[PDB]
């Protein structure tokens, strides 16, 4: 995760829950319970998309697997993939569906999928993160530590 404009992060929602993973499924949980250790997330810019939309890549596990939006029957779908965030920095058309637009709503942020426009990262109501079409359930916060 040592590249230009490359930083480490932890991702929280409005209620201090942190992104973590269990067997590849992105979930939200209390960082402080020994049950939910948070994903150490690498963030990289996508230099080929419109910078004013803050295009970024999302790399869990220190940047070893990246979050993507895939178009299926059930709709758009979040997927974690065996792709390193440096391969995405190389660029190309294929990196768009690993790209999220980081849209600021004040101090928080929304994460909208570039390959599935109008769809936003969405926290579960009940105790898996998903995609949805301003709400606190689509609001996120980046801490370096």
């Amino acid at each position, epitope marked *: 995760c040592s590249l230009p404009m490359a930083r480490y992060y932890i991702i929280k929602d409005a209620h201090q829950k942190a992104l973590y993973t269990r067997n*590849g499924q992105l979930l939200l949980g209390d960082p402080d319970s020994d049950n939910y250790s948070p994903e*150490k997330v690498c963030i990289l810019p996508n230099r080929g998309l419109d910078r004013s939309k803050v295009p970024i890549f999302l790399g869990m*596990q220190g940047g070893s697997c990246c979050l993507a939006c895939v178009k299926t029957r059930e709709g758009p779908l979040l997927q974690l993939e065996d792709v*390193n965030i440096e391969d995405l920095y190389k660029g190309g058309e294929q990196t768009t569906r690993f790209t999220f637009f980081q849209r600021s709503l004040g101090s928080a942020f929304r994460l909208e999928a570039a390959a599935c426009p109008g769809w936003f990262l969405c926290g579960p109501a009940e105790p898996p993160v998903q995609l949805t079409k301003p709400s606190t359930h689509t609001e996120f916060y980046f801490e370096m530590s």
Partner: antibody, heavy 125, light 106 residues
């Protein structure tokens, strides 16, 4: 699901060998292919990985620039091109598969669920 | 990245409880897999994603994490468990543990 390796054998120092990994029962598009090697009496060492779908490849430091992994999605067959072989490359070479996508049915945390029985490579004058 | 495995070898009697420990050198990694390798055989996958049991593997195998320390557990050792066990960091520069030789004590 079946993975079959071929092309192993004896080869002199500095020589070249090409290995083959012929896959069945799964799609190349939905998986990654890996080469892992094991010297007599020693532990597992990863060699290289390729994503056929995205065409990304990774290599262990000890073979970068000598080894090249590739795939032909039409044949569901992966290849290891080995050049400038040395004696310490002597090992059994397995190819193995992982499911790329966390949402795929048989996803297993990117662990190597299927392996071949491996092909022996001897580097020796 | 490193995966330090311990012990390098152990012998234990049938039915005993066996644990093997693998310590990762970075804390952002938690997708550890555990493999069983029998004489002249390809490795066989036991545990994936740190603690999920793979289809078919006997229920007496389990895996757990505590920080950077990953543990495989064989609850009652069986004679067929003679093998070498490896842990694996699954991403990018893939890394194995040095391996643990498990001899059955009779």
């Amino acid at each position: 699901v079946q993975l079959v390796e071929s092309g192993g054998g004896l080869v002199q120092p500095g020589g070249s060998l090409r290995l083959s990994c012929a896959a069945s029962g799964f799609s190349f598009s939905s998986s990654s292919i890996h080469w892992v090697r094991q010297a007599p009496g020693k532990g597992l060492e990863w060699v290289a990985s390729i994503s056929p779908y995205y065409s990304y490849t990774s290599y262990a430091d000890s073979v970068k620039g000598r080894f090249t992994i590739s795939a032909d999605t039409s044949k569901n067959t992966a290849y290891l091109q080995m050049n400038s072989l040395r004696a310490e490359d002597t090992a059994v070479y397995y190819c193995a598969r992982t499911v790329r996508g966390s949402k795929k049915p048989y996803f297993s945390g990117w662990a190597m669920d299927y392996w071949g029985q491996g092909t022996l490579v001897t580097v020796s004058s | 990245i490193q995966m330090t495995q311990s012990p390098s070898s152990l012998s234990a009697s049938v039915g005993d409880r066996v644990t093997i420990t693998c310590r990762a050198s970075q804390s952002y990694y938690s997708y550890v897999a555990w493999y069983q390798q029998k004489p002249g055989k390809a490795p066989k996958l036991l545990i994936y994603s740190a603690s999920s049991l793979y289809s078919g593997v006997p229920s007496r195998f389990s895996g757990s994490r505590s920080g950077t320390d990953f543990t495989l557990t064989i609850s009652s050792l069986q004679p067929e468990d003679f093998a070498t066990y490896y842990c694996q960091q699954v991403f990018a520069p893939i890394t194995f543990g040095q391996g643990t030789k498990v001899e059955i004590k009779r």
